[PDB]
Design a binder for this molecule. Structure first.
Ligand SMILES: C[N+](C)(C)CCOP(=O)(O)O
Ligand SMILES: C[N+](C)(C)CCOP(=O)(O)O
Ligand SMILES: C[N+](C)(C)CCOP(=O)(O)O
Ligand SMILES: C[N+](C)(C)CCOP(=O)(O)O
Ligand SMILES: [Cl-]
Ligand SMILES: [Cl-]
Ligand SMILES: [Cl-]
Ligand SMILES: [Cl-]
Ligand SMILES: [K+]
Ligand SMILES: [K+]
Ligand SMILES: [K+]
Ligand SMILES: [K+]
Ligand SMILES: [K+]
Ligand SMILES: [K+]
Ligand SMILES: [K+]
Ligand SMILES: [K+]
Ligand SMILES: [K+]
Ligand SMILES: [K+]
Ligand SMILES: [Sm+3]
Ligand SMILES: [Sm+3]
Ligand SMILES: [Sm+3]
Ligand SMILES: [Sm+3]
Ligand SMILES: [Sm+3]
Ligand SMILES: [Sm+3]
Ligand SMILES: [Sm+3]
Ligand SMILES: [Sm+3]
Ligand SMILES: [Sm+3]
Ligand SMILES: [Sm+3]
Ligand SMILES: [Sm+3]
Ligand SMILES: [Sm+3]
Ligand SMILES: [Sm+3]
Ligand SMILES: [Sm+3]
Ligand SMILES: [Sm+3]
Ligand SMILES: [Sm+3]
Lengths: 264, 264, 264, 264
């Protein structure tokens, strides 16, 4: 089967949580505090009852934790709860900001890779697209081959080759980017064929990072391919157009399109 | 026409929003929450009326959302609204900080580029100026040529050459910086002339990034030039002066000035 | 004795504190403010008494600092204290966030290093493990030798060699990573033996940094080894397994295991 | 005179402010808001008077801006002021955090540089010291020569040479670091002497950056030297000691000490 899924996640099981709050969906986060919020008040409401030091307990609890202080219920450790309410809000605000600043890239990866000549040399290719109007600055991309290898002797392990790209870094990335690994004699897949790639159970990982100007935050994206997601002889279709207006356009509708010469 | 505008933006149309709040002007941001703020209270004010569980509805709403708690209007889900008011403030504070920390560079770019000899070799040049008193640390600059190219065969595409600079990085950038691409035989515009640059519809993109010490934040700036914004034979005028005091000064009034030898 | 401890700390004494608040345990932090919090109110409570400008002093103090404003105690510099309460919360919230964002890596280091052949060359090795489910992006690792050296003449000093690794950087680090320094003729420990390493009192420092996608934060980890924590001839045991399901697993239970050929 | 001061600041005058709040001393910052804080309330207090829509104006103003809500003064745009108070606090909290996170390095620079042989080659040297107990990670240092130069023809300009160091980067920096520029034939000051350095009015800039583990923040430091602050033949004294305990110590008391052979 597959070590990597398309989204670049691994299926390796591991035998051996602020992050969970950070990761969980927006709806669930509110719920999770809302709960913590009610509960903490139940704590104090029962802490008062245990007595009657308050004129005229759950609702009084929140009135003093939120610092509403209506007044109809004058106290007496309210002071304690006022501390807790303020740290609660401070803690709350931190998580909010961390969640807001979690990296997030709208980078589209091509559904396939191709191997075809480029500048007269066979080249492994794939392409990326920036899905947002704002540019990504100082972008960098890696293409990694992961593949089963063994010594002349029986030992079996998975190799990790970081492949050489004609352009791994780019100061700016705004539209589309075809990433290219020329398969010369230094290439790990030099001389390789469709059949020999399957045998090595070999796979490809794409990793992307850059900085948005779109937000004061960094971004990451990754994607993975199996060897049967490579189109030999294929070529990515141009996604750039000239409109009737005479103006240049990017058509992402053609982004996954690949041309192939069909033999008889 | 032009793919790039002076400010380094593209005119490519794309066929295929926390950022909007982050981007929008300061005046509009306040308005946008102020609205959200009033509205959310209208929600609760109508949520109470639907009944009369409050002694002595919009104004009571805010009194419990802001946690003012005057008291003349004692309750009963106020508790719910107290949660919302606190997250509202937390959300509010996040956006504020993100906006405050959005990258912003006061970098001035020269209105033109020049090509003239430098150390006995023709050199593409342009210059940058730091507009603030605080230095930018670990600055880096790129000069990119974008240009139409085609195969011997008919296919037409735009090239992107990241040009070699005598100095792409600088640990500090405080005043003025003339960026230089020597046009040797490795240069994409080697042997090139005024006429041949127009034909390729070729353009130049400048990209700048660095870290301020001025704020704990990074900065970006970019600018673009057409081939008719290059002055062949031109030289940037020295912007450094010695004052009457005998003290050294930077005169940004001369920043866009270029000297030219005029032929008969 | 040892300059470095396993955890990569030094024992060098130095003859010559927001950070303390930032560093201190979670329990102690709350205590430290709680104190500051009570005390600041004692200040104002005594500032009122010094007179009786309040209808119907410590408890009134907090009611106006937390902005509870019950009302049974109407005032008059309350205004002053309302400023202080708000900055207190602002200061509080900053420390909280800084603490939350302090770098933290769950990177496991192997208890030993080994020197054994790899691709037919003797190689210094050690391994790292990512202890969390989330990957570390753009990871980098250094292996440094620290060692006593002297001139032909008597002067004695400690050298710091940053060793060459077959792979110092990795775009992603998710599971396990064996770091390798081939001991060729350019190596500081080329020709070196067990005995000659002890004489130089030589030590090894591992330094790790990378960015989590797990949180919008960076991470650091380091570890140190003495020369008697190197196993000559040793080999790290494969920590990867195939489960009954036929699925691939990582067994960290084998992470510190090293195989050795035992001579007669 | 001098272009650079010891602290690495320039004396170049420039002919052509959130940062000010960010920069200003701690005492002045509080004052600056305290003012803004009082004033904004004067605005509303006069906005009420202009009438009498409040039962039983400056003090009522703060009671509704701080959300104290005592109650003895029930309202009516209080709602407006409750918005302002909350953004005020949000703005306040942002500045606080930005100030807290402003880069700050406790890096000590040696009062002088030296030129003396090292590994049998004349070497420009200076040293740095980490003044805090926490290490700086991924540190980098530059040595720049700035110097007047002119063409064979009369034109006069200041050069900026980024000098080659035996070690410009270090994964960790914890104690002391002697930075070294070997003066080989590629060096801008190769063949140079004391007298020829003065004539070029030449100067040296040190720039330091790294990341603390001490706080989740980066650091910068810089320093400058004139040519008469170079000691020819000088050697930095070892700052490392062995204590009576037999334990290794760092004595910063010797940090600026330089040994010199005195000729007859
Ligand atoms: C393709 N590229 C990123 C390498 C260069 C051009 O940038 P872009 O304008 O196509 O986004
Ligand atoms: C021009 N430079 C940035 C490359 C070097 C000098 O820095 P600056 O002092 O002119 O700002
Ligand atoms: C070992 N490595 C980090 C260099 C490459 C592979 O990454 P990983 O998937 O094993 O964590
Ligand atoms: C000197 N150095 C930073 C290059 C290497 C050693 O680090 P340190 O332990 O002396 O601080
Ligand atoms: Cl993932
Ligand atoms: Cl732009
Ligand atoms: Cl440590
Ligand atoms: Cl300075
Ligand atoms: K309140
Ligand atoms: K509040
Ligand atoms: K209140
Ligand atoms: K109140
Ligand atoms: K009240
Ligand atoms: K806050
Ligand atoms: K914050
Ligand atoms: K923050
Ligand atoms: K940050
Ligand atoms: K950062
Ligand atoms: Sm969980
Ligand atoms: Sm760059
Ligand atoms: Sm086949
Ligand atoms: Sm990167
Ligand atoms: Sm929009
Ligand atoms: Sm550098
Ligand atoms: Sm012409
Ligand atoms: Sm950069
Ligand atoms: Sm302490
Ligand atoms: Sm990379
Ligand atoms: Sm031995
Ligand atoms: Sm790093
Ligand atoms: Sm000012
Ligand atoms: Sm490194
Ligand atoms: Sm002399
Ligand atoms: Sm740096």
């Amino acid at each position: 089967p597959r070590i990597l899924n398309s989204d670049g996640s691994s299926n390796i099981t591991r035998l051996g949580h602020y992050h969970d709050l950070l990761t969980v969906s927006w709806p669930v986060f509110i719920t999770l505090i809302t709960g913590l919020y009610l509960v903490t008040n139940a704590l104090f409401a029962l802490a008062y009852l245990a007595g009657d030091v308050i004129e005229n307990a759950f609702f009084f609890s929140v009135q003093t934790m939120a610092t509403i202080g209506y007044g109809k219920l004058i106290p007496t450790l309210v002071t304690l709860e006022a501390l807790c309410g303020m740290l609660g809000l401070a803690v709350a605000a931190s998580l909010i900001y961390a969640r807001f600043t979690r990296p997030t890239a709208g980078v589209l990866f091509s559904s396939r890779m191709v191997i075809s000549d480029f500048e007269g040399k066979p080249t492994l290719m794939m392409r990326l697209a920036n899905l947002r109007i704002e540019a990504i600055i100082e972008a960098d991309v890696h293409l990694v081959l992961v593949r089963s290898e063994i010594s002349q002797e029986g030992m079996v392990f998975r190799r990790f080759h970081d492949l050489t790209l004609t352009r791994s870094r780019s100061p700016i990335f705004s539209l589309s980017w075809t990433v290219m690994h020329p398969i010369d004699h230094h290439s790990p897949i030099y001389g390789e064929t469709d059949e020999t790639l399957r045998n090595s159970h070999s796979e490809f990982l794409v990793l992307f990072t850059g900085h948005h100007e779109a937000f004061a935050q960094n971004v990451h994206a990754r994607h993975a391919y199996s060897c049967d997601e490579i189109i030999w002889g294929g070529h990515f279709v141009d996604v750039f157009t000239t409109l009737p207006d005479g103006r240049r356009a990017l058509d992402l509708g053609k982004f996954h399109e690949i041309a192939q010469h069909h033999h008889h």
